[PDB]
Amino acid sequence: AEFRVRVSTGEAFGAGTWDKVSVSIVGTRGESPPLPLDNLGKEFTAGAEEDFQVTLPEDVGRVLLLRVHKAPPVLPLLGPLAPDAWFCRWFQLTPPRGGHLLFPCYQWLEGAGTLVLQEGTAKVSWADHHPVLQQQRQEELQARQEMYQWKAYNPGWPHCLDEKTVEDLELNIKYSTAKNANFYLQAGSAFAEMKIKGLLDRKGLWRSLNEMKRIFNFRRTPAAEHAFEHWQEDAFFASQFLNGLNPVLIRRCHYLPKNFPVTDAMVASVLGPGTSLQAELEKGSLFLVDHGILSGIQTNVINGKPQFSAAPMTLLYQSPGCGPLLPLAIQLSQTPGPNSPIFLPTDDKWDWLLAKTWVRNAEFSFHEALTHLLHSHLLPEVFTLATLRQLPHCHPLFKLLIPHTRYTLHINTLARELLIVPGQVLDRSTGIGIEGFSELIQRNMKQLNYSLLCLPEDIRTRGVEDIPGYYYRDDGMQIWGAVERFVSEIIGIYYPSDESVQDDRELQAWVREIFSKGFLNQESSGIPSSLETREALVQYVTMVIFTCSAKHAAVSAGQFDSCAWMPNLPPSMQLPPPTSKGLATCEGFIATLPPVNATCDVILALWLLSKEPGDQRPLGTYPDEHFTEEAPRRSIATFQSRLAQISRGIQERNQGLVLPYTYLDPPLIENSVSI
Ligand SMILES: CCCCCCCCOCCOCCOCCOCCO
Ligand SMILES: CCCCCCCCOCCOCCOCCOCCO
Ligand SMILES: [Ca+2]
Ligand SMILES: [Ca+2]
Ligand SMILES: [Fe+2]
């Protein structure tokens, strides 16, 4: 008839509560009356953990549900008070001479109401058929689906959350007040610096290449100074296709596209007389970076001046024996001919540099619209929203995935509110603008596939499993492995058979919703619409976790490093590509690069998005203990120590590198997409 009730309250700002709190214990034999927890004093302040003794009049049998009621204090003749939001971490029941029942919560009880919690043992739908529990899950998902709905944002995009402003979001999916203030103080300080130098207000060109170094009095990193030092070197231009901002396009080439008419003469130069184009295509030493998806893209206006975008192709040569990757030829158009010369490293200094810079402009547009926004933000939001809608709090797959959604709905809502709207940085300072970004996302959504999101298949598909110096691959594959091993352990704990995967109705609705709302029911994407085997579930969940953590970390962390020296990543171009050779100059080169205000507005935004503001939850670190069972908790431990070992490999590796690759070091990977 006695229970001890132990309650943990959150540490965040505002976590604690004035309000009175009572719990009803529901069991197989019946439900108890509400039981007070107010005890003596302000028991529910931030960071508190405190015990209460409740006596149950009637026995309840096996405990099934904990109902938590919250209500503001009540004054005689004056009514209640304003509700005081409470962040509850978890409850622990301890019956007479029995073990502990632990009820993970980790949510906000804003205002007055009641919250129903199952014990912490993860339960697939078929795992406990008690009707009281089936009702609770069913009611929870109905409530979630009303809370968190879909809207169509643009034609041909993935659908997104049906909310207009960050103000309208539930506490449970909002930035913490600490992370939010850290964010606005950074952005505020940075905008102030950049504005008071008049650089956000200079229309017109940079005065010289020297003047563009002024960006280093704004912000400095060693990676970014390296780009100033080495930007003109062919080996650094090429190395950034493997370890820079956008390391996902390079692919081995046995057959040159017919629209890229490279000749033997054009490459005898770099290749030596001991070989031939056809001989190197066959040897597997030639690689292609194809920016064709940009062809004919709508372009923007900046300070009333039309801007330009190319859609180029770059041939690259892997020299033997850990030698450098080297560019061989660049065509800046998808349609060859006399007005789209094929530029070579042997051309005049500024012809070749101008050609390389247009490719670097193309990486800017490709990376930010597709690799960053669509693949690392929109797809994680779909995964997140589907999870909220289809997987209930007690489901092992919710327990597993929820840390990897943190703040994702918040940050995408913010982008839709303040980033991709008129007057903001996209519209005022990029070459392709809002419309070009949407065009790119619409095109990509029509040829996107599962293999690009699964890193081992992506590496295999692109024929880049052996190319040396590819640290995005080296480190990403180790991480992929660690996540895959973690997910496979967790699946094996709770799903005994392929039949049990199919029989999971909630799991099947979750995949289906992702396929429909996120991938627009396109069977050409190859993304599963159902999951029939344990093996396929493991692969699919690994893809979600990897995409939400390491994938976004890999393509977000080098943004500022890559763009601080603007010729290394011009966000726009102001003259069309050259239509013949022998015309490029330094003066002409700076005249093609973007105006000062657009340069700085973009760097300011890339600096703020490169860095996690506020506090970090690095990959594998799970302070909200949704898993309360020994087995998953061992699996977490194994995942954490494997990441730490990968991190030691990365520092040892990086020790003897002039340009270390840090974007996939696990401590610096966030669990979710949050910036
Ligand atoms: C971290 C402060 C956040 C303040 C937000 C808006 C600030 C308005 O302008 C002041 C920020 O400018 C900082 C630039 O540094 C000049 C101040 O002194 C720097 C040497 O300590
Ligand atoms: C002064 C502009 C600072 C930016 C503040 C708003 C950031 C909120 O959105 C971030 C989430 O969006 C991520 C998508 O990738 C961003 C692509 O934009 C880069 C073009 O500059
Ligand atoms: Ca409060
Ligand atoms: Ca109290
Ligand atoms: Fe991001």
XYZ file of C-alpha atoms and ligand atoms in Angstrom:
720
model
C 0.000 0.000 0.000
C 3.086 2.286 0.255
C 5.218 3.779 -2.508
C 8.194 6.067 -2.476
C 8.008 8.584 -5.332
C 11.323 10.107 -6.414
C 11.129 13.038 -8.818
C 13.870 14.703 -10.872
C 13.370 18.281 -12.092
C 15.363 19.806 -14.915
C 18.237 22.257 -14.601
C 17.249 24.596 -17.454
C 16.103 28.154 -16.891
C 12.487 28.049 -15.772
C 12.577 24.293 -15.140
C 11.239 24.498 -11.608
C 7.663 25.099 -10.616
C 5.494 26.737 -7.972
C 2.599 24.494 -8.959
C 1.220 21.558 -6.995
C 1.785 18.091 -8.398
C -0.033 14.804 -7.875
C 0.244 11.334 -9.366
C -2.318 8.640 -10.043
C -0.875 5.133 -10.267
C -2.792 2.914 -12.724
C -2.495 -0.867 -12.466
C -3.943 -4.109 -13.753
C -6.245 -4.280 -10.694
C -7.365 -0.636 -10.851
C -6.381 3.010 -10.537
C -5.527 4.978 -7.433
C -6.839 8.369 -6.361
C -4.612 11.377 -7.070
C -1.799 11.389 -4.531
C -0.173 14.695 -3.442
C 3.525 15.398 -3.818
C 3.779 18.936 -2.403
C 5.287 17.850 0.950
C 7.140 20.808 2.548
C 8.516 23.872 0.796
C 9.476 24.451 -2.825
C 10.144 20.826 -3.631
C 10.127 21.234 -7.408
C 12.817 23.786 -8.063
C 15.352 23.547 -10.841
C 17.812 20.671 -10.552
C 15.884 19.236 -7.605
C 15.585 15.508 -6.989
C 13.339 14.654 -4.091
C 11.403 11.856 -2.474
C 7.737 11.662 -1.480
C 5.864 8.966 0.411
C 2.409 8.156 -0.941
C 0.123 5.539 0.564
C -2.328 3.743 -1.725
C -5.634 2.786 -0.087
C -6.377 -0.070 -2.489
C -3.787 -2.249 -4.175
C -3.323 -1.707 -7.934
C -1.448 -4.841 -9.037
C 1.161 -4.690 -11.776
C 1.852 -1.029 -12.460
C 0.953 0.072 -15.986
C 0.712 3.875 -16.143
C 1.738 6.935 -14.102
C -0.625 9.895 -14.563
C 1.050 13.170 -13.556
C -1.286 16.070 -12.777
C -0.172 19.702 -12.522
C -2.200 22.649 -11.235
C -1.314 26.174 -10.093
C -1.888 26.894 -6.372
C -5.438 27.930 -5.447
C -6.235 30.918 -3.246
C -9.552 30.972 -1.340
C -11.801 33.642 -2.924
C -9.204 34.565 -5.588
C -8.912 31.508 -7.833
C -5.743 29.920 -9.141
C -2.583 31.669 -10.330
C -0.759 31.812 -13.643
C 0.661 28.342 -14.441
C 4.394 27.897 -13.882
C 6.017 25.673 -16.502
C 7.724 22.585 -15.117
C 10.368 20.505 -16.849
C 10.089 16.977 -15.460
C 12.998 14.619 -16.035
C 11.633 11.383 -14.517
C 9.757 9.674 -11.670
C 10.762 6.562 -9.735
C 8.258 4.389 -7.918
C 9.502 1.987 -5.260
C 6.918 -0.498 -3.961
C 7.149 -2.267 -0.602
C 10.120 -4.659 -0.770
C 10.339 -4.423 -4.545
C 12.591 -3.179 -7.290
C 12.327 0.221 -8.878
C 9.919 1.324 -11.554
C 11.467 4.178 -13.536
C 9.297 6.488 -15.677
C 11.370 8.557 -18.116
C 9.689 11.852 -18.962
C 12.031 14.624 -20.194
C 9.308 17.053 -21.202
C 7.702 20.364 -20.233
C 4.345 20.495 -18.438
C 3.440 24.057 -19.427
C 0.091 25.149 -17.998
C -2.341 22.886 -16.166
C -3.145 19.402 -17.403
C -2.234 15.764 -17.070
C 0.566 13.711 -18.577
C 0.533 9.914 -18.815
C 3.785 7.957 -18.608
C 4.544 4.302 -19.168
C 7.343 2.604 -17.271
C 10.762 2.939 -18.879
C 10.991 -0.565 -20.345
C 10.829 -0.049 -24.085
C 7.706 -1.649 -25.548
C 6.959 -2.308 -29.197
C 3.214 -2.435 -29.785
C 3.102 -6.225 -29.774
C 5.267 -6.420 -26.642
C 2.579 -5.724 -24.017
C -0.962 -6.267 -25.199
C -2.603 -5.003 -22.030
C -5.499 -2.845 -23.311
C -4.841 -0.003 -20.868
C -1.385 0.354 -22.453
C -2.637 0.036 -26.052
C -5.161 2.835 -25.386
C -2.446 5.090 -23.968
C -0.164 4.667 -26.995
C -3.044 5.217 -29.362
C -4.225 8.349 -27.579
C -0.664 9.703 -27.410
C -0.101 9.399 -31.154
C -3.468 11.021 -31.848
C -2.451 13.942 -29.656
C 0.989 14.182 -31.293
C -0.565 14.209 -34.752
C -2.787 17.118 -33.803
C 0.178 18.914 -32.207
C 2.646 18.436 -35.048
C 1.257 18.573 -38.550
C 2.508 18.723 -42.101
C 2.310 21.541 -44.573
C 3.402 21.797 -48.170
C 6.045 24.467 -48.371
C 6.797 24.575 -52.097
C 5.928 22.279 -54.989
C 8.427 19.458 -55.352
C 9.964 19.940 -51.914
C 9.672 17.671 -48.916
C 6.834 18.702 -46.677
C 7.652 20.436 -43.423
C 6.131 21.428 -40.098
C 2.875 23.341 -40.200
C 4.107 26.291 -38.131
C 4.921 29.841 -39.238
C 7.169 31.256 -36.563
C 9.468 30.041 -33.829
C 7.125 31.821 -31.395
C 4.289 29.371 -32.100
C 6.256 26.242 -31.249
C 5.765 23.977 -28.262
C 8.268 24.383 -25.454
C 9.265 20.765 -26.007
C 10.729 21.496 -29.442
C 12.105 24.975 -28.817
C 15.651 26.130 -28.351
C 16.501 26.308 -24.664
C 16.497 29.875 -23.442
C 20.267 29.500 -22.867
C 21.022 28.255 -26.384
C 18.771 30.913 -27.860
C 20.437 33.779 -26.029
C 23.908 32.473 -26.854
C 22.754 32.473 -30.486
C 21.383 36.001 -30.584
C 24.409 37.455 -28.754
C 26.752 35.882 -31.317
C 24.704 37.019 -34.288
C 24.155 40.414 -32.692
C 27.839 40.948 -31.918
C 28.875 39.739 -35.379
C 26.329 41.878 -37.189
C 27.517 44.894 -35.183
C 31.167 44.346 -36.102
C 30.308 43.867 -39.766
C 27.929 46.845 -40.029
C 30.110 49.392 -38.196
C 32.946 48.783 -40.707
C 30.511 49.870 -43.440
C 31.042 46.567 -45.187
C 27.380 45.511 -45.238
C 26.643 48.818 -46.987
C 29.387 49.037 -49.627
C 27.930 48.320 -52.999
C 30.665 48.025 -55.546
C 33.690 45.832 -55.890
C 36.512 45.079 -53.573
C 39.386 47.427 -54.313
C 41.900 44.590 -54.723
C 42.611 41.053 -53.601
C 44.553 42.427 -50.660
C 41.473 44.268 -49.398
C 39.508 40.994 -49.180
C 41.872 39.976 -46.364
C 39.922 42.493 -44.250
C 37.581 39.552 -43.493
C 40.280 38.248 -41.133
C 39.767 41.288 -38.874
C 36.184 40.053 -38.568
C 37.004 36.410 -37.780
C 40.016 34.119 -38.124
C 40.569 30.396 -38.036
C 43.705 28.557 -39.133
C 41.724 26.553 -41.676
C 40.500 29.823 -43.192
C 43.941 31.439 -43.311
C 45.170 28.289 -45.022
C 42.667 28.900 -47.822
C 44.054 32.407 -48.313
C 47.597 31.044 -48.390
C 46.981 28.147 -50.749
C 43.875 29.073 -52.739
C 45.717 29.294 -56.057
C 47.346 25.852 -55.804
C 45.779 23.143 -57.954
C 46.333 20.490 -55.270
C 44.256 22.516 -52.771
C 41.492 23.203 -55.263
C 41.340 19.449 -55.808
C 41.759 18.410 -52.170
C 38.633 20.378 -51.205
C 36.514 17.987 -53.288
C 37.568 15.311 -50.771
C 38.042 17.187 -47.456
C 36.403 20.550 -47.843
C 32.908 21.950 -47.693
C 31.158 19.603 -50.148
C 32.936 16.259 -50.241
C 30.132 14.238 -51.864
C 30.322 14.704 -55.655
C 33.699 13.427 -56.834
C 33.258 10.132 -58.678
C 35.410 7.770 -60.674
C 35.077 8.118 -64.415
C 35.611 5.354 -66.986
C 33.557 7.093 -69.704
C 33.719 10.817 -70.243
C 30.297 12.388 -70.817
C 29.906 13.161 -74.524
C 29.147 16.799 -73.686
C 32.624 17.148 -72.094
C 34.863 16.661 -75.135
C 38.286 16.397 -73.461
C 41.111 15.351 -75.757
C 44.404 13.557 -75.470
C 46.262 16.696 -76.503
C 44.526 18.664 -73.772
C 45.951 16.363 -71.078
C 49.265 15.179 -72.539
C 50.511 18.129 -70.575
C 49.666 16.919 -67.073
C 49.757 13.193 -67.836
C 53.194 12.795 -69.427
C 53.859 11.232 -72.823
C 53.852 7.724 -71.356
C 50.050 7.401 -71.507
C 46.759 8.621 -72.940
C 43.310 9.753 -71.848
C 41.753 6.405 -72.739
C 44.516 4.563 -70.883
C 43.901 6.567 -67.723
C 40.118 6.256 -67.910
C 40.656 2.508 -67.982
C 43.280 2.526 -65.224
C 40.722 4.223 -62.949
C 42.860 7.279 -62.203
C 40.371 9.838 -63.583
C 37.619 11.399 -61.496
C 34.799 13.774 -62.339
C 32.988 16.450 -60.397
C 29.794 17.194 -62.352
C 27.801 20.309 -61.433
C 25.257 19.782 -64.203
C 22.209 20.094 -61.965
C 22.845 23.879 -61.974
C 22.362 24.191 -65.751
C 19.944 26.946 -66.734
C 19.152 27.822 -63.115
C 17.253 30.987 -62.312
C 19.664 33.677 -61.170
C 19.315 36.575 -58.755
C 19.850 40.321 -58.794
C 22.263 42.011 -56.376
C 22.396 45.796 -55.977
C 20.339 45.940 -59.146
C 22.970 43.966 -61.066
C 22.071 40.608 -62.642
C 24.215 37.719 -61.456
C 25.429 34.547 -63.104
C 25.921 30.893 -62.357
C 27.713 28.214 -64.317
C 27.100 24.456 -64.204
C 30.516 23.084 -64.835
C 32.415 19.852 -65.098
C 35.872 19.164 -63.679
C 38.154 16.338 -64.659
C 40.688 15.336 -62.032
C 43.657 12.975 -62.045
C 44.839 10.864 -59.107
C 48.605 10.792 -59.495
C 50.203 7.495 -58.538
C 51.332 6.601 -55.078
C 49.624 8.938 -52.635
C 50.610 11.810 -54.918
C 48.144 14.656 -55.238
C 44.773 14.769 -56.838
C 45.173 17.241 -59.689
C 42.692 19.118 -61.880
C 43.080 18.387 -65.617
C 40.272 20.225 -67.372
C 37.275 22.435 -66.629
C 34.327 23.171 -68.891
C 32.045 25.782 -67.394
C 28.932 24.813 -69.364
C 26.927 21.667 -69.886
C 26.789 22.512 -73.603
C 30.239 22.340 -75.198
C 31.446 24.410 -78.072
C 33.511 27.387 -79.114
C 31.802 29.676 -76.562
C 32.525 27.347 -73.618
C 36.271 26.691 -73.807
C 37.763 23.745 -71.996
C 40.149 25.393 -69.564
C 43.426 23.738 -68.637
C 46.046 24.191 -65.893
C 48.409 25.216 -68.683
C 46.364 28.232 -69.695
C 47.306 31.818 -68.823
C 47.330 32.411 -65.085
C 44.003 34.227 -64.864
C 42.167 32.035 -67.411
C 42.785 28.967 -65.254
C 42.140 30.722 -61.961
C 38.916 32.206 -63.291
C 37.843 28.722 -64.361
C 38.597 27.254 -60.941
C 36.736 30.067 -59.224
C 33.573 29.419 -61.217
C 33.691 25.804 -60.084
C 34.086 27.052 -56.516
C 31.033 29.290 -57.056
C 29.163 26.206 -58.252
C 30.113 24.360 -55.049
C 28.688 27.227 -53.083
C 25.279 27.026 -54.740
C 25.218 23.216 -54.877
C 26.362 22.799 -51.284
C 24.109 25.254 -49.570
C 20.900 24.383 -51.416
C 21.383 20.634 -51.641
C 24.075 19.190 -49.404
C 23.349 21.548 -46.565
C 19.714 22.669 -46.711
C 17.905 19.762 -48.398
C 20.001 16.753 -47.338
C 21.161 17.923 -43.871
C 18.162 20.033 -42.745
C 14.946 19.163 -44.611
C 15.404 15.403 -44.563
C 16.238 15.463 -40.804
C 13.081 17.510 -40.161
C 10.996 14.943 -42.051
C 12.599 12.177 -40.007
C 11.943 14.163 -36.847
C 8.346 15.053 -37.604
C 7.557 11.488 -38.649
C 9.121 10.235 -35.401
C 7.020 12.618 -33.301
C 3.903 11.577 -35.164
C 4.256 7.800 -35.410
C 6.481 6.509 -32.609
C 5.138 6.763 -29.050
C 7.224 7.715 -25.996
C 7.657 4.104 -24.817
C 8.755 2.683 -28.217
C 12.423 1.633 -28.382
C 12.794 3.432 -31.696
C 11.530 6.692 -30.214
C 13.852 6.193 -27.247
C 16.709 5.684 -29.682
C 15.977 8.475 -32.123
C 14.713 11.349 -29.960
C 18.150 12.760 -28.959
C 18.936 12.877 -32.667
C 16.074 15.246 -33.409
C 16.865 17.895 -30.782
C 16.113 21.456 -31.933
C 15.768 20.419 -35.585
C 12.200 21.625 -35.950
C 13.176 24.850 -34.204
C 16.105 25.659 -36.460
C 14.288 24.887 -39.716
C 11.284 26.944 -38.603
C 13.757 29.741 -37.967
C 15.316 29.417 -41.431
C 11.871 29.580 -43.016
C 11.163 32.670 -40.944
C 14.387 34.648 -41.257
C 16.723 33.136 -43.881
C 14.971 32.028 -47.043
C 12.461 34.863 -47.166
C 12.644 38.118 -49.131
C 15.070 40.733 -47.895
C 17.267 38.225 -46.053
C 20.664 36.896 -46.908
C 19.657 34.402 -49.624
C 17.602 36.975 -51.531
C 20.000 39.872 -51.164
C 23.462 38.259 -51.483
C 23.569 34.952 -53.426
C 23.864 34.437 -57.155
C 20.956 32.030 -57.516
C 18.750 33.434 -54.782
C 15.576 32.075 -53.320
C 14.219 30.927 -56.672
C 17.437 29.198 -57.700
C 17.566 27.355 -54.409
C 14.046 26.053 -54.869
C 14.730 25.048 -58.489
C 17.778 23.150 -57.292
C 15.804 21.362 -54.560
C 12.998 20.466 -56.961
C 15.466 18.997 -59.494
C 17.379 17.088 -56.854
C 14.256 15.640 -55.256
C 13.562 13.952 -58.620
C 16.864 12.059 -58.862
C 17.741 11.624 -55.181
C 18.217 8.109 -53.839
C 18.821 5.940 -50.786
C 22.386 5.149 -51.770
C 23.496 8.778 -51.478
C 22.322 8.802 -47.853
C 24.007 5.491 -46.909
C 27.670 6.319 -46.824
C 29.054 2.833 -47.638
C 26.748 2.607 -50.671
C 27.517 6.185 -51.685
C 31.263 5.506 -51.553
C 30.777 2.319 -53.589
C 28.476 3.985 -56.113
C 30.962 6.820 -56.758
C 33.957 4.478 -57.113
C 35.924 6.369 -54.469
C 36.572 3.574 -51.962
C 40.380 3.688 -52.521
C 41.239 7.257 -53.518
C 43.892 8.492 -51.040
C 43.645 11.428 -48.715
C 39.833 11.166 -48.553
C 39.314 11.865 -44.869
C 35.601 12.588 -45.085
C 35.332 8.983 -46.224
C 37.952 7.551 -43.836
C 36.317 9.140 -40.791
C 32.724 8.930 -41.963
C 32.990 5.209 -42.603
C 34.343 4.517 -39.088
C 31.478 6.539 -37.628
C 28.964 4.838 -39.915
C 30.237 1.487 -38.648
C 29.915 2.544 -35.017
C 26.358 3.765 -35.520
C 25.419 0.661 -37.553
C 26.781 -1.584 -34.773
C 24.905 0.443 -32.158
C 21.601 0.303 -34.065
C 21.970 -3.397 -34.831
C 22.458 -4.169 -31.128
C 19.362 -2.165 -30.236
C 17.248 -3.804 -32.952
C 18.475 -7.258 -31.914
C 17.458 -6.567 -28.326
C 13.801 -5.822 -29.119
C 13.007 -7.387 -32.546
C 13.581 -11.161 -32.547
C 12.526 -11.774 -36.154
C 11.877 -10.204 -39.523
C 8.211 -10.985 -38.804
C 8.276 -8.761 -35.724
C 9.502 -5.844 -37.871
C 6.603 -6.264 -40.312
C 4.160 -6.714 -37.443
C 5.197 -3.325 -35.962
C 2.314 -1.169 -37.228
C 3.800 2.040 -35.766
C 7.168 1.380 -37.398
C 5.437 0.778 -40.756
C 3.444 4.012 -40.532
C 6.694 5.855 -39.705
C 8.546 4.659 -42.814
C 5.468 5.213 -44.978
C 5.098 8.806 -43.732
C 8.732 9.524 -44.456
C 8.396 8.013 -47.910
C 5.262 10.009 -48.628
C 5.818 13.346 -46.852
C 9.602 13.481 -47.242
C 10.223 11.746 -50.565
C 6.872 12.449 -52.298
C 6.063 8.774 -52.887
C 8.757 8.631 -55.564
C 9.718 4.976 -56.096
C 12.769 6.120 -58.143
C 14.329 7.365 -54.899
C 14.843 3.770 -53.789
C 13.871 4.733 -50.228
C 11.814 1.971 -48.573
C 8.082 2.455 -48.201
C 7.969 -0.444 -45.760
C 10.526 -2.420 -43.800
C 10.365 -6.182 -43.982
C 13.590 -7.419 -42.372
C 15.690 -6.644 -39.331
C 18.622 -6.022 -41.674
C 16.700 -3.383 -43.626
C 15.520 -1.646 -40.443
C 19.070 -1.492 -39.100
C 20.309 0.066 -42.317
C 17.432 2.547 -42.455
C 17.763 3.772 -38.850
C 21.540 4.072 -39.231
C 20.882 6.303 -42.224
C 18.596 8.521 -40.137
C 21.006 8.826 -37.210
C 24.041 9.348 -39.423
C 22.282 11.954 -41.531
C 21.168 13.909 -38.435
C 24.595 13.974 -36.768
C 27.767 13.258 -38.700
C 26.426 14.052 -42.169
C 25.367 17.534 -41.136
C 28.538 18.003 -39.085
C 30.637 17.082 -42.123
C 29.024 19.624 -44.446
C 28.381 22.373 -41.890
C 31.682 22.703 -39.931
C 33.910 23.881 -42.777
C 31.572 26.557 -44.020
C 33.447 29.527 -42.640
C 36.835 27.836 -43.150
C 35.854 27.493 -46.802
C 34.311 30.954 -47.448
C 36.293 33.427 -45.300
C 38.702 33.899 -48.231
C 35.978 34.760 -50.704
C 37.731 33.700 -53.971
C 37.736 30.207 -52.463
C 33.888 30.209 -52.320
C 32.254 33.103 -54.124
C 28.496 33.160 -53.416
C 27.737 34.907 -56.715
C 29.341 36.005 -59.984
C 28.650 39.271 -61.716
C 29.760 38.598 -65.271
C 28.922 35.537 -67.335
C 31.519 32.829 -67.830
C 34.223 33.516 -70.394
C 33.419 32.565 -73.959
C 37.012 32.350 -75.061
C 40.529 32.184 -73.668
C 43.129 34.929 -73.324
C 40.852 37.581 -71.829
C 41.108 37.152 -68.076
C 42.986 39.687 -65.956
C 43.262 40.499 -62.288
C 41.085 43.579 -62.838
C 38.563 41.474 -64.727
C 38.766 38.775 -62.083
C 37.813 41.095 -59.238
C 35.076 42.602 -61.398
C 33.471 39.130 -61.710
C 33.569 38.474 -57.972
C 30.638 39.673 -55.867
C 30.259 43.136 -54.355
C 31.539 43.892 -50.866
C 28.175 43.980 -49.094
C 27.088 40.612 -50.532
C 30.449 39.015 -49.741
C 30.288 40.122 -46.123
C 26.613 39.375 -45.618
C 27.240 35.809 -46.726
C 30.385 35.320 -44.647
C 28.598 36.718 -41.629
C 25.856 34.174 -42.116
C 28.225 31.291 -42.748
C 30.236 32.129 -39.652
C 27.065 31.989 -37.505
C 25.935 28.671 -39.036
C 29.321 26.931 -38.783
C 29.309 26.810 -35.007
C 26.954 25.183 -32.543
C 25.768 28.021 -30.290
C 25.075 27.501 -26.686
C 25.793 24.083 -25.308
C 26.559 20.876 -27.109
C 25.283 17.327 -26.889
C 28.054 15.510 -28.812
C 27.224 12.316 -30.705
C 26.612 9.341 -28.417
C 26.063 11.405 -25.286
C 22.553 10.828 -23.963
C 21.876 12.594 -20.646
C 18.112 12.047 -21.028
C 17.879 8.378 -20.089
C 14.941 7.199 -22.157
C 16.484 3.734 -22.111
C 16.207 2.462 -18.557
C 17.143 -1.163 -19.233
C 20.597 -2.674 -18.733
C 20.936 -4.048 -22.290
C 20.480 -0.865 -24.339
C 22.521 1.011 -21.736
C 25.461 -1.361 -22.340
C 25.040 -0.741 -26.083
C 25.256 3.002 -25.514
C 28.441 2.472 -23.516
C 29.937 0.443 -26.368
C 28.974 3.177 -28.845
C 30.522 5.875 -26.680
C 33.840 4.138 -26.205
C 34.067 3.279 -29.901
C 33.572 6.944 -30.804
C 36.277 7.950 -28.318
C 38.649 5.479 -29.991
C 37.773 6.863 -33.385
C 38.524 10.336 -31.998
C 41.974 9.231 -30.921
C 42.626 7.861 -34.409
C 41.661 11.215 -35.872
C 44.041 13.196 -33.658
C 46.886 10.763 -34.350
C 46.113 10.956 -38.073
C 45.884 14.733 -38.026
C 49.185 15.086 -36.156
C 51.178 14.772 -39.376
C 48.946 16.850 -41.631
C 49.443 20.456 -42.688
C 45.641 20.655 -43.136
C 43.912 18.397 -40.604
C 40.395 17.175 -41.130
C 38.393 17.849 -37.951
C 34.779 18.008 -39.200
C 34.031 14.373 -38.270
C 35.895 14.163 -34.947
C 33.107 12.687 -32.730
C 33.352 15.152 -29.791
C 32.687 17.922 -32.330
C 29.689 16.192 -33.937
C 26.317 17.201 -32.539
C 23.660 14.519 -31.936
C 21.126 16.427 -34.086
C 20.809 19.235 -36.622
C 20.506 22.259 -34.403
C 22.249 25.096 -36.301
C 29.125 39.331 -26.612
C 28.466 40.717 -26.699
C 27.110 40.628 -27.427
C 26.505 42.037 -27.671
C 25.468 42.092 -28.797
C 25.401 43.434 -29.579
C 26.652 44.311 -29.322
C 26.801 45.669 -30.026
O 28.154 46.005 -30.293
C 29.159 45.551 -29.424
C 29.826 44.258 -29.898
O 31.033 44.519 -30.564
C 32.081 43.662 -30.206
C 33.318 44.041 -31.013
O 34.359 44.241 -30.100
C 34.521 45.550 -29.611
C 34.381 45.550 -28.085
O 35.606 45.297 -27.451
C 36.368 44.237 -27.971
C 37.676 44.100 -27.175
O 37.443 43.462 -25.945
C 22.786 37.443 -40.982
C 22.251 36.047 -41.395
C 22.490 35.004 -40.282
C 21.642 33.729 -40.434
C 20.567 33.668 -39.343
C 19.415 32.704 -39.676
C 19.894 31.245 -39.630
C 18.701 30.292 -39.460
O 18.681 29.272 -40.424
C 19.619 28.251 -40.254
C 19.095 26.932 -40.804
O 19.255 26.844 -42.200
C 20.271 25.952 -42.585
C 20.216 25.808 -44.091
O 21.441 26.172 -44.653
C 21.629 27.559 -44.723
C 21.898 27.975 -46.169
O 22.050 29.367 -46.257
C 23.345 29.826 -46.599
C 23.245 31.033 -47.551
O 23.886 32.146 -46.986
Ca 9.055 27.589 -14.432
Ca 5.840 21.743 -3.006
Fe 23.166 23.565 -40.573
